[PDB]
Amino acid sequence: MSRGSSAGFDRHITIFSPEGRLYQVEYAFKAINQGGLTSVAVRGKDCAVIVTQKKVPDKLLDSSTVTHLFKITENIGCVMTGMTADSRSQVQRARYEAANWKYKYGYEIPVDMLCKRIADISQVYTQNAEMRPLGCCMILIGIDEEQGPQVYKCDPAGYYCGFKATAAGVKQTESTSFLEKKVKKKFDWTFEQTVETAITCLSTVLSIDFKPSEIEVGVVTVENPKFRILTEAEIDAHLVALAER
Template identity: 55%
Template sequence: MSRSSYDRYLTVFSPEGRLYQVEYAFKAISGSGHTAIAVRGKDTSVVITQKKVADKLIDASTVTHLFSITPTIGCVMTGLIADARSQVARARSEAANFRYKYGYEITPDALARRIANINQVYTQRAAMRPLGISMILIGIDPEFGPQVFKLDPAGFFVGFHATAAGQKQQEAMNFLEKKWKKLEGGADDAAKAGKRLSRAEVIEMAIEVISTVHSTDFKPGEVEIGIVSDAPEEDEKTRGSWRVMEDDEVEAHLLAYGEKD
């Protein structure tokens, strides 16, 4: 049988053991034209992604790939934005149910595990289809500090010190690995290397990666930055909470990175 005979059904394996419909969901992520970067340090987690407004008539303030899930957890979604909004709504519902049931906010790893389980169900029932998006969750865990988790359409999730998703994922991952090897100079492992990154260094690294892989000096309106930080430099009102940076703050960080070059 030809490949087309196996890619019509979500629940049918090809002779090579592949589920083509799930693979197509991964292609939808890389084909979206966006790249997202996430980095975590000793007291801060940051996500950065491109902001593309397709038409001058569109209100730019309504275009975003960054979403708040709980007061302390946010995410960047890469892929089909309609699927992204659907998954964000489900994540918010799961987080609210957890708060109602247990009396405290869900932790980033528990939320990542729950959404990954839901994603996996979408790969095993013929009446569903995998969502064509990659979710990168960031938040502060009361016990373990800053966290970064990436979830894919197949239901796999794992924690990262730094990661990327989207169009330039592989180039970004390669660049991040090189940066991490330099950091590991005096550290015993990657975890200790990450603990040396301050709030400013985490933001700078995220900007450096997205600028390098796209060979572009971005303007404030062309990128979005989401942050969760417990650092002393963070304003007391927003410390430990998820927020999206305003354009003037983004511009300050972009200028600081540009001047360093």
């Protein structure tokens, strides 16, 4: 029951430690930060924005294939943080779950339902000892007819929740503090204000001035519920608007 106590194989498989913890899940949480990237999601009154940093170390790498933004359905987009192959497997699972939900129930899956399904699968990974949990974090973005923009994040522990703003990656603590400060000083957030808030959060937690090719922005709005990825021209316009002021 003491802090840091270990017994048997509690460090190697997902069984309880004397304190009642699961160390493998925490190790998967550290595997999330092993990727080295950071992503920020912010919810507006009529929009929702995900911004993640795009690192292409070498020119031999085709930049159009290094994407951490994925679309699950026409109206749902996601940003993945952590291990790349785990993130791609989870994206494929989410796409399958959404397609199956539409086939079986006759209407598009809500963002909360998809996050709940992914969290259930990751919980199953956390309870059975024969398989590794996924070292990836998923943030979902979409528009609900009744409630509006939705920001949902699920973790390897099986936990999921909705957010006004959230972050994931190496600098998620600093980004969450910055977003706490921004949200506490509550004021009307249009689409432009939400995009600038996310971009400036990423820039200030990374302490680097951004170029349009160094980040990746995806948005959903009430007017256009389809998930889309901003091109370099639109990101450049947003960056210029940020830099002038």
